[PDB]
Design an enzyme around this catalytic site. Sequence first.
Site, PDB file in Angstrom:
ATOM      1  N   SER A 132       2.794  -3.342  -3.803  1.00  0.00           N
ATOM      2  CA  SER A 132       1.979  -1.182  -4.312  1.00  0.00           C
ATOM      3  C   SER A 132       1.847  -1.663  -6.213  1.00  0.00           C
ATOM      4  O   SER A 132       2.911  -2.411  -6.100  1.00  0.00           O
ATOM      5  CB  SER A 132       2.968  -0.439  -3.849  1.00  0.00           C
ATOM      6  OG  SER A 132       2.477  -0.122  -2.543  1.00  0.00           O
ATOM      7  N   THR A 186       0.449  -1.415   0.056  1.00  0.00           N
ATOM      8  CA  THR A 186      -0.188   0.175   0.009  1.00  0.00           C
ATOM      9  C   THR A 186       0.455   1.660   0.278  1.00  0.00           C
ATOM     10  O   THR A 186       1.772   1.476   0.656  1.00  0.00           O
ATOM     11  CB  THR A 186      -0.772   0.344   0.977  1.00  0.00           C
ATOM     12  OG1 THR A 186      -1.505  -1.458   1.662  1.00  0.00           O
ATOM     13  CG2 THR A 186      -1.931   1.535   1.093  1.00  0.00           C
ATOM     14  N   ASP A 197       8.505  -1.283  -5.590  1.00  0.00           N
ATOM     15  CA  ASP A 197       8.122  -1.893  -3.886  1.00  0.00           C
ATOM     16  C   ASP A 197       6.750  -2.492  -4.200  1.00  0.00           C
ATOM     17  O   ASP A 197       6.288  -2.566  -5.499  1.00  0.00           O
ATOM     18  CB  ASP A 197       6.653  -0.867  -3.006  1.00  0.00           C
ATOM     19  CG  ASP A 197       6.584  -1.470  -2.231  1.00  0.00           C
ATOM     20  OD1 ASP A 197       7.611  -1.594  -0.937  1.00  0.00           O
ATOM     21  OD2 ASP A 197       5.309  -1.721  -2.038  1.00  0.00           O
ATOM     22  N   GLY A 253      -2.440  -0.497   5.893  1.00  0.00           N
ATOM     23  CA  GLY A 253      -1.452  -1.470   6.822  1.00  0.00           C
ATOM     24  C   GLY A 253      -3.470  -2.554   6.684  1.00  0.00           C
ATOM     25  O   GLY A 253      -3.730  -2.929   5.367  1.00  0.00           O
ATOM     26  N   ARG A 294      -3.394  -2.603  -5.325  1.00  0.00           N
ATOM     27  CA  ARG A 294      -3.148  -3.451  -5.289  1.00  0.00           C
ATOM     28  C   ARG A 294      -3.397  -4.232  -4.010  1.00  0.00           C
ATOM     29  O   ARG A 294      -2.452  -3.454  -3.026  1.00  0.00           O
ATOM     30  CB  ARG A 294      -1.255  -4.043  -5.741  1.00  0.00           C
ATOM     31  CG  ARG A 294      -0.981  -4.873  -5.164  1.00  0.00           C
ATOM     32  CD  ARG A 294      -0.120  -5.298  -5.732  1.00  0.00           C
ATOM     33  NE  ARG A 294       0.738  -6.271  -6.910  1.00  0.00           N
ATOM     34  CZ  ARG A 294       2.123  -5.728  -7.713  1.00  0.00           C
ATOM     35  NH1 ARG A 294       3.116  -6.143  -6.588  1.00  0.00           N
ATOM     36  NH2 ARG A 294       1.944  -7.211  -8.395  1.00  0.00           N
ATOM     37  N   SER A 332       4.040   1.109   2.542  1.00  0.00           N
ATOM     38  CA  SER A 332       5.151  -0.001   2.625  1.00  0.00           C
ATOM     39  C   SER A 332       6.181   1.015   1.528  1.00  0.00           C
ATOM     40  O   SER A 332       6.933   1.182   1.823  1.00  0.00           O
ATOM     41  CB  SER A 332       4.913  -0.846   2.238  1.00  0.00           C
ATOM     42  OG  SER A 332       4.278  -1.348   1.149  1.00  0.00           O
ATOM     43  N   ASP A 378      -2.693   3.461  -4.613  1.00  0.00           N
ATOM     44  CA  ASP A 378      -2.595   2.733  -5.354  1.00  0.00           C
ATOM     45  C   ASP A 378      -3.551   1.966  -5.504  1.00  0.00           C
ATOM     46  O   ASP A 378      -4.502   1.958  -4.867  1.00  0.00           O
ATOM     47  CB  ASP A 378      -0.848   1.413  -4.927  1.00  0.00           C
ATOM     48  CG  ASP A 378      -0.916   0.755  -3.875  1.00  0.00           C
ATOM     49  OD1 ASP A 378      -0.314   0.191  -3.249  1.00  0.00           O
ATOM     50  OD2 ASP A 378      -2.246   0.957  -2.606  1.00  0.00           O
ATOM     51  N   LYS A 407      -8.538   2.185  -1.832  1.00  0.00           N
ATOM     52  CA  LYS A 407      -7.857   2.517  -0.546  1.00  0.00           C
ATOM     53  C   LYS A 407      -8.877   3.734  -0.772  1.00  0.00           C
ATOM     54  O   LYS A 407      -8.172   4.343   0.798  1.00  0.00           O
ATOM     55  CB  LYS A 407      -6.945   2.073  -1.092  1.00  0.00           C
ATOM     56  CG  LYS A 407      -6.805   0.945  -1.031  1.00  0.00           C
ATOM     57  CD  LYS A 407      -4.555   0.489  -1.098  1.00  0.00           C
ATOM     58  CE  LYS A 407      -4.404  -0.462  -1.609  1.00  0.00           C
ATOM     59  NZ  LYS A 407      -3.159  -1.247  -2.215  1.00  0.00           N
TER      60      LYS A 407
END
Lengths: 229, 229, 202, 219, 206, 206, 218, 214, 204
Positions: free
Chosen positions: D169, D1, D166, D47, D19, D129, D17, D33
């Site tokens: 994400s 995230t 990352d 999270g 995913r 992240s 994002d 999100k």
Amino acid sequence: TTILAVSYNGGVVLAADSRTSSGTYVVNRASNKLTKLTKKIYCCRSGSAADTQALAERVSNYLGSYQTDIGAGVNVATAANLFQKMCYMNRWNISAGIIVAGYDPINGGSVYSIPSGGSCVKLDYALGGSGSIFLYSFFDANYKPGMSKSECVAFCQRAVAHAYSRDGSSGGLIRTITLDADEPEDQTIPWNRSPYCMEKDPKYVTQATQNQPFSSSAKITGNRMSSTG
Amino acid sequence: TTILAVSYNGGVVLAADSRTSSGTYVVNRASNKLTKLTKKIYCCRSGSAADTQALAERVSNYLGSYQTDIGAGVNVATAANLFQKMCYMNRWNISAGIIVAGYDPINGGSVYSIPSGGSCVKLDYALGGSGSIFLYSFFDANYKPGMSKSECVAFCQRAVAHAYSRDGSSGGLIRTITLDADEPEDQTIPWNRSPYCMEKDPKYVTQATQNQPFSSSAKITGNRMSSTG
Amino acid sequence: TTTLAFRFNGGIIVAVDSRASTGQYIASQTVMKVLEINDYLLGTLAGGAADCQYWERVLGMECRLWELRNGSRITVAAASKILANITYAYRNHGLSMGTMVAGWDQFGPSLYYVDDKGSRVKQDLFSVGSGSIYAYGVLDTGYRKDLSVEDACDLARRSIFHATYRDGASGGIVTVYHVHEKGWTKISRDDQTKLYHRYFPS
Amino acid sequence: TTIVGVVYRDGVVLGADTRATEGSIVADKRCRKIHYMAPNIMCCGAGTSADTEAVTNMVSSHLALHRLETGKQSRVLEALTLLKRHLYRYQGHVSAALVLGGVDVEGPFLATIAPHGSTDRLPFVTMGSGSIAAMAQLEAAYKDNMTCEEAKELVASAIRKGIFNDPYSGTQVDVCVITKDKTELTIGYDKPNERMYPRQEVLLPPGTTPVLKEEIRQL
Amino acid sequence: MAETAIAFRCKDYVMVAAAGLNAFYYIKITDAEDKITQLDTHQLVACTGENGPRVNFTEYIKCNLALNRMRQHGRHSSCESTANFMRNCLASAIRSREGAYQVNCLFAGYDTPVSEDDDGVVGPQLFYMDYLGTLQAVPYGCHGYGACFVTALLDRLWRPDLSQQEGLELMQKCCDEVKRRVIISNSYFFVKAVTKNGVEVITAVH
Amino acid sequence: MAETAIAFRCKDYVMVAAAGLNAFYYIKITDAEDKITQLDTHQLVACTGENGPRVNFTEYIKCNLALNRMRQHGRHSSCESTANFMRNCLASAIRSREGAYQVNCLFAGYDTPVSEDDDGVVGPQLFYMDYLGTLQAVPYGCHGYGACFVTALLDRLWRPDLSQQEGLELMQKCCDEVKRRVIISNSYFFVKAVTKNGVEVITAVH
Amino acid sequence: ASGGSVIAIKYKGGVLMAADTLLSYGSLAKWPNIPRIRLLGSHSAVCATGSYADFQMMAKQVEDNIERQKMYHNVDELSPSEVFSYLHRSIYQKRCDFDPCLCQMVFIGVRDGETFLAGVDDVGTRWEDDCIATGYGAYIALPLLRQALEKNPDGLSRGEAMRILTDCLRVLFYRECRAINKFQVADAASDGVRISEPFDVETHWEYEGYCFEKTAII
Amino acid sequence: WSPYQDNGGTTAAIAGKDFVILAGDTRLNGDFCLHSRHDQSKIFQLTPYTYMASNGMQADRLQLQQMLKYRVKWYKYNNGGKVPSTKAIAQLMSTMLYHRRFFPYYTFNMVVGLDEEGHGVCYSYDAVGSTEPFLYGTRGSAASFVEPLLDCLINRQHMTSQAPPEMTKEETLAMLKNAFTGAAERDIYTGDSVSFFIITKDGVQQESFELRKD
Amino acid sequence: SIMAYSGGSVMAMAGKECFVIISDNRLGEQLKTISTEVPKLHVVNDSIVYGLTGLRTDQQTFANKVQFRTEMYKLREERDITGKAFAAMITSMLYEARFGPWFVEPVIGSIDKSTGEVYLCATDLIGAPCEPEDYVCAGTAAESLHGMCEALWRPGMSPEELFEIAAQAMLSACDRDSLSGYGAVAMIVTKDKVTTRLIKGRKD
Ligand SMILES: Cc1nc(C)c(C(=O)Nc2ccc(F)c(-c3nc4ncc(-c5ncccc5C)cn4n3)c2)o1
């Protein structure tokens, strides 16, 4: 335990406290952390005492043999490299922070710092020991390079007296030694003559108003210093 | 995290850094650790951020109600006692070091220090935070009581700039506030105007002679700064 | 893992499944559990596949060396003691292997079980593995000395099939080997599900 | 995230994002999100998705109850206070790092709540992240008083840094823009990872999978 | 500890009895495995423990006694010597790298006058031996789980001068007691007896 | 886990068989203790576990079924109800303070048409029940150590329409198998059978 | 003691490796005026993150090997890729002895056209790219370098790459605790590696959103 | 500090009638960052008809590749220029993997090569050396994605449809591309660019294929 | 751990105006098959069907609670509970006991009777809802099912074709798993009818 070394034009000035402690008890209150290796090269040792004593005497035994063999004085780089090598292949078993300082006719006065990890950094002034961290922000403020010999030892004694006044693990005599072209000269100023102490500092004379008398107003007026009052 | 408070004739001067860090990463580089409780009483909070924010807002919510009820200004002893009580019955769960400073017409300017343990000591000048220990031996040397308002804020900014220059956990803006009889006044000097920094300190300009060129003599002559040389 | 071998009047019968599960994921459905050491001995693989493969290959090197030197085939009682010493020397290095050496030497057929701590037993009925507890049940109640070679092979096949059906760590292809005085021959090799509609039809 | 928020000239711009991974495996490729809190308050979350959705829905219903009571639009300081109270009451077991952004009579407002309850009000914030790889972009490109187009380019670029660098994400960029009046939420603002190597549609003519017995039930 | 070894000395014989159980974690590998290993023609050892250590230790002891007899041209060793020599390996193992021989033994034998000059013991000998290297000449010993049940049982019924048949019946009593009071399946018991004629596999009781 | 409970359903009866073993750490307290507790006139439960939890849980279940029958003026409950109600206590225990009922059960019964309007099950019912609260209607189930050995054994030999005597002989086979392959001393097996006449203590096999 | 972060990037014709000149002791900034860029032989340079003793020993051990080999025998000095290979093999060999060389190194070099830039971990992992970064530079700095590479894959210029090196050093200063604003840039071109004098990158701390009233939690 | 680490990645091979298609994803990731997208240290050519493709820790496979290459060179020098066969290389690798049994290699390996009659065969190893010869096989973090897909299109079980013709080079290549494009969309650590090696009798050819970079 | 104790796997796929939900049959205790004839599917009305997975005791407890709640809903509100309301309901039920968590991982599939819109959902064990447009899967064979489906499924599949892909995916995915298998049971539900089919799998 506080040790430091400051370099000036001619040579170097080593200063240190004198107190080995068992955590919270003063085992030895007149210790001597300035160990000579050669006539003109000394080391201030901090951390454990057994490990640093074994290392200092082993390295000095090496230095005595190299100097006899070659027949001419030893640089400080030699001793610093020997210390770094030893304190590096024992880095897991010993906790030993060294400050090797000396004078050689080739490169003048030199100070090397060998921390716990085992590196070796050649500096202009080095600090070490548990009570050192109180000296960094003292050197950033009151220290300027290019000092004379006398002003250097005055600054070193002042730094150590400001370090062991606030630190619990440090204290006792202030032992300094100056290494330069002339004979190496020693000096030990006691605690009752130190250039600083938090008992004779007039900003710590008036006490904190903690024991308020049972009173009727909210005005603070100092402690309660007697039963009648 | 470095916070401090210094008392002068009229009132008090609070100074602090601005950087909350996750151990080794700068989470917030423009934080604000000076939390107002009343119009004339502030607190610098150090340690964890969630705990001290909850405590500051709970105590300020208490102080707003007491002052409305009684109808007259609040001393600093009230707020300091409330903080001590709270940070004492949570001493196992929170890690929160507070510096409560303010001005009341009765007792002038006042500074209380409530450390991790939960005590409450009324002092003349208080230091706190992870980067504080570099300031004790700075205040023992360069600080004299009885300063003026302007010289006090100059000394406070200088102390914080000497504390966050050497400390890794501290840095960023220097935020000060002066609380006295007049309106409480704020000030935030950035890092590119700080009264000290180890990059612009001319004793840290010449580098340590570490990368010696492969040479034929034992004379040290500085680093190797190119392949040709 | 399910492995069994039983002795009767007519030789020794070995039978195995062919699945190697790494916890809850099935690595493969074609692992070969019966490692033919030589033309006369059969060793079975149970436990750590690496350990069993390696040490039974070492044992197959040592039996061949024995034969070269003395000029006579090694016996099962001695071919099994080699593995017991090998395993007992490493009893404190964390091996995980339980194997069964089955052969037909000049003293008739012999069948030994060699563990991962050096244990070495000689019985006429073994079934090692995680589904072993399901073989014994169908093995002990049908086993008798005087079985015809086909009747005993069927007992072994129908006994492995019931271990593959109740256990999650066993299954695949049931394979049956026969050890007689002339050597050994792979009797049959059949999928575990084609057996299901052959034993419980309709 | 990876959630970012940028305060621009008039309003705020939030991005995230899409995913969502359930334990080292991409469960859904187009999860959303950027939740909804009020007609003028949006709230990205990072999270554990459970707590991020639970606490957001809780305080989003509370704010609606409240603004029906008072009759005024809801303030972002109220949402921020409710969120931080609830989060601190649980000592961080409710592990949802939130980025809460809205527009008031006091101008835009963009704050961030750590899972422990601490809040910061900043010009730009990033959580998740890939919060370190996205912040690296905002520090390098944030100038004051950016126009809406510049804020959206900046948020898209700051997300595409977490998308590519990352593992947890990517696959899209959600960008919502909040102003004083409106709030427009574009879902597919940028889709860099495009649909390459088209499917082969393996053909299985119905009946190849044997069936034992079937009961069909008409309704 | 699961498999019990009973042994008791009478006037003119020793009896040992070893539960032939052999198990894998709870699965009975076998209920008939001979745990009484004969060393010399008049001596035997009842070992209890895992199979690895048991077999390795017993084979080592047997090979060393055999070699010593070869190096002395058919000179049998007495039972004190074999007992002390077993004890020495058991004891030196617990201060080695490989560790202890996790096996407990009962050494039984019948000492025969080897020559005309011989003036040693003539009677039977039983030696209790722990895994740590303890060594004690006992009148009767027992190892394992049932070791306690039968030990008390022997105190009530053992007499210095039981004959062969009363020894048989006492062994029957102790064996059935172990079967009746221990949770472990010890059904077959492998009784052997040492007398001036050598070792004899007693078949009746089990 | 030591004491095995075997149970299998046939056309017109259920059989259960419970090892009456009772132990203290390895000492056989008893080899005959009835572990098959009858709840109602057509239902019984074979529990395996420690004695404390077993007796307390079974007494609790029995008292609650009896009370419910009192509150309904002699209305017997079907076996699905008793099974689900046992499962509910077993399951709610693992999220309480006192913790799980560390006892596994096999619920057997024979459902009888209670009235003329009744159109429920008429056949026998067997329910496997884990200690965590699992509940599954099985044709045959087994609990404990031997549970595996007999389960495979039943797959080879069980048929939907075994008579009474073939049920007897199959139970003899499974019981002897458990005795022959488990290290634990399970000698006496306590076979009971549920049929349209009620529960009957089968004495022949054991 | 322990160094900070290192970043490095290949441009059209050479390599650039930037590193801050500071050694820390945990949280304390101990020595802010020491050189962390070493250079080996006459074509290559190295810089390590993490413990300083291990880097100091390893760089010494691989600088003794280069000069001896060239001085004893009449051979050409080792190319960048080969001295890096020796570095990697020695790090792996120290790791197998549970005597790890706990420092991630970045290695640059140029020899007559074939420009080389690699990185090695301490567990033995080695890699090679057009942009390397260790410490926290792998998270903060590396994404910016990667985008600045892909926005023009033909090859950056020297000034156009020094620009982005400054722009990433700035962020590394902002967002890394144990870092200071005095860096060094070793530039390796065909002539040979050349370390620059320490320089400082300018910053910005005057956003309006940092004002005392706004950042206040009253 | 632990001397182990997992650098992700995945590999997968399919053996045919007179060829083998080996595939490895070129992506190297460290602790939490992404080291490289051009990592070619997975597929290592031992002999002109044999390759080893390994996943797991990167230092361990860079070490094992050199150990195997030197063992192959010794075998070539002792046997008068006779390049070893795939079977010999696979057995050698098992023996090598088991010698370091107590401080193991953290790799999962596949020795992909051609047999003597021309048929292609693959091998698969555990961490300690449990080899098993087989006709296809995948290893790495994306194993449980690709394996059941190949199991379903190659073995053609659970489909009442007569077995299709034998798959050639192009068809197998396309199938493996499908598998990798499907595994690059559900595994977080897999796929920046995959490299295919078509091993045939008249040498080997090599191709690349590009995936999503997220 | 604890979620792979009882084995089991469920998987739902969306067609055009329909969807298929399929589950395995195995019930065991961490290695040993207790029974081989237990499906995982529960039908609440002619347009919803969900399947649980996790610990088996918690599967049964949660299924009882969900049935209690659904029958209570149809009584208070005189109407069939729709799909989205059902998924949100069980999400709240799961998040209630957030620190005493249930060990289930439900998989809901539903369709609008007249509208024709399909709706899939698959929550975590702590309530995180995750609604895709193609397919969901849960259980011990999660990764393998994901792999098979992301390759076999395509947007506009019809019922008699969607059943094929569903069956093939479940079989090939349970073949590489030791805690699932023993055939499967599938339910293909459309706007007009619901069909149940038992699928022959390996008896392994
Ligand atoms: C005479 C006799 N009677 C029996 C019953 C035995 C016996 O059991 N001997 C034995 C010795 C050593 C072993 F190592 C093993 C052995 N077999 C196994 N099969 C499968 C798995 C396994 N695999 C994957 C995942 C999880 C597991 C548990 C593990 N093991 N361990 C078995 O010997």
